[PDB]
Amino acid sequence: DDKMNTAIKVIHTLKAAGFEAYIVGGAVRDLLLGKTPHDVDVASSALPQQVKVLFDRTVDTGIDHGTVLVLLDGEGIEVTTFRTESVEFVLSLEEDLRRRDFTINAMAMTEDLKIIDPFGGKEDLKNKVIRAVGDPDERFEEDALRMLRAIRFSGQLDFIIDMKTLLSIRRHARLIRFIAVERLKSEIDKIFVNPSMQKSMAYLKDSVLTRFLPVGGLFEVDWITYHTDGNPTYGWLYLLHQQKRQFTDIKDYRFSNEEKRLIEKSLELTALNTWDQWTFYKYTLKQLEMASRVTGKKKDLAAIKRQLPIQSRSELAVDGWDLIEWSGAKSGPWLKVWIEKIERLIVYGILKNDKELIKDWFEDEY
Ligand SMILES: Nc1ccn([C@@H]2O[C@H](COP(=O)(O)CP(=O)(O)OP(=O)(O)O)[C@@H](O)[C@H]2O)c(=O)n1
């Protein structure tokens, strides 16, 4: 939240060197909404190498596209040269704003706090409307992902989508197929944690994006009993659980191994009639919480797990080499079966986790 101050100092430096600079995009939107901006972007008439001259420290990752990350007073500000979008640098602020996605994202602010609003973002912000800048057909052909951003913003801001803009989404919905699935999944992950995400989901159906998103029909579930826990993964679990489907049906969205395992393990738990000590031992607390959260069950899961005789197999007082000695037999897959028998008897509190007593038990059974 010191970002605005840093952006102001960036702007003074650029203007002192004789360039134009302005705050633009979401920070302006968020300011007029009374929020604290999460990121502050600066747009400037300076070219990237000219920016690097004025500040000691910078990151040149986005240089190709006009962006340089300035590091100042412990913050980072993206300074981007006036540009459209395969990237052309333009000479005036308005040429840059004319190509942004929505009126509320298309405003600029001077360091002396004047708002520059050539497209009515002020009014659309007051009236709670997401509306494309200029011709909605052009904005959505420039980048089809904007159709989905419109949906995300409606649930993030509790705005409506301009009628003309929504009809344009319906006409161009099929263009969604050309977007990298990583970008699709990133926006869907944001929808899943939004307040009033149910508004986003209704628009997703009604804009007939669910016809063309990957396995898009699976989003048309009832979302009324869904409340986010801040973790986007829970949205995917909910979806699958409502429809009695498996993780494999959504794999096109390219989940990490962590996400995959968490969804699959949680689904497993919802399929279980009853949970006993062994359940609480084999599944992680995170998996149990989401399976609970989605099945309506409520227990003190941390308390039940805290009370098991052991927490993981690493505390087992025995290993398969102990069983090789005691049995006289040769190492083989049979060890895994017997290690699990022993592990059960310890988790149910029947056998003590003590090598000597386990040895006594093992010789009798073998
Ligand atoms: N497809 C796109 C993606 C971005 N933009 C423009 O990039 C700026 C913010 O991008 P950003 O990456 O910081 C996301 P923002 O719009 O600020 O919302 P958030 O902070 O809640 O994530 C806005 O002026 C948008 O008009 C666009 O015109 N078309």
| Number of folded domains that form the chain | 4
Same domain (yes/no): 281, 169:
no
Same domain (yes/no): 293, 353:
no
Same domain (yes/no): 232, 338:
no
Same domain (yes/no): 123, 16:
yes
Instruction: Tell me how far the alpha carbon of residue 43 lies from the centroid of ligand 1, in angstroms.
Output: 13
Same domain (yes/no): 14, 107:
yes
Which residue ranges make up the annotated binding site for CTP? 29, 100-101, 105, 143, 146, 149, 152, 156
Contacts of 258 (CB under 8 A, 6+ apart): none
> Which token pair is 359?
């040895």
Give the span between the Cα atoms of 273 and 291, in whole angstroms. 12
Give the span between the Cα atoms of 77 and 42, in whole angstroms. 7
Task: Find out whether the beta carbon of 162 lies less than 6 Å from any atom of ligand 1.
Answer: no
Instruction: Answer for the pair 153, 188: CB distance below 8 angstroms, yes or no.
Output: no
Q: Which domain holds residue 214?
A: 134-226
Same domain (yes/no): 146, 48:
no
**Experimental structure resolution, Å:** 2.3
Question: What phi, psi does 89 have (nearest 5°)?
Answer: -90, 125
Give the span between the Cα atoms of 63 and 69, in whole angstroms. 9
Q: What is the CATH number of the domain that holds 42?
A: 3.30.460.10
- Tell which of 168, 193, 226 closes a domain: 226
Task: Find out whether the beta carbon of 101 lies less than 6 Å from any atom of ligand 1.
Answer: yes
- Tell which of 133, 168, 196 closes a domain: 133
Q: What is the CATH number of the domain that holds 344?
A: 1.10.246.80
Same domain (yes/no): 31, 97:
yes
Instruction: Answer for the pair 102, 130: CB distance below 8 angstroms, yes or no.
Output: yes
Same domain (yes/no): 14, 84:
yes
Neighbours of 104 (CB within 10 A): 30
Instruction: Answer for the pair 185, 254: CB distance below 8 angstroms, yes or no.
Output: yes
Same domain (yes/no): 192, 239:
no
Same domain (yes/no): 31, 50:
yes
Instruction: Answer for the pair 73, 36: CB distance below 8 angstroms, yes or no.
Output: no
Ligand 1 closest atom vs CA 101: 28
Task: Find out whether the beta carbon of 145 lies less than 6 Å from any atom of ligand 1.
Answer: yes
Between the alpha carbon of residue 74 and those of residues 37, 71, 212, the distances in Å are: 16, 7, 44
- Following CA atoms 351, 354, 360, 363 in sequence, which dihedral angle do they give, to the nearest 10 degrees? 90
User: For every residue of the chain, which 3-state class applies, written as one string?
Assistant: CCHHHHHHHHHHHHHHCCCCEEEECHHHHHHHCCCCCCCCEEEECCCHHHHHHHCCEEECCCHHHCEEEEEECCEEEEEEECEECCCEECCCHHHHHCCCCEHHHCCEECCCCCEECCCCHHHHHHHCEECECCCHHHHHHHCCHHHHHHHHHHHHHCCEECHHHHHHHHHHHHHHHHCCHHHHHHHHHHHHHCCCHHHHHHHHHHCCCCCCCCCHHHHCCCCCCCCCCCCHHHHHHHHHHHHCCCHHHHHHHCCCHHHHHHHHHHHHHHCCCCCCHHHHHHCCHHHHHHHHHHHCCCCCHHHHHHCCCCCCHHHCCCCHHHHHHHHCCCCCCHHHHHHHHHHHHHHCCCCCCCHHHHHHHHHHHC
Give the span between the Cα atoms of 289 and 297, in whole angstroms. 9
Q: Which one, of 341, 332, 340, 348, lies nearest residue 365 by Cα?
A: 341
Neighbours of 289 (CB within 10 A): 19
> Which token pair is 265?
């393990």
Give the span between the Cα atoms of 148 and 139, in whole angstroms. 12
Nearest CA to ligand 1 atom 21: 26
Same domain (yes/no): 331, 217:
no
Same domain (yes/no): 45, 151:
no
- Tell which of 264, 292, 309 closes a domain: 309
Strand partners, 58: 70
Neighbours of 93 (CB within 10 A): 19
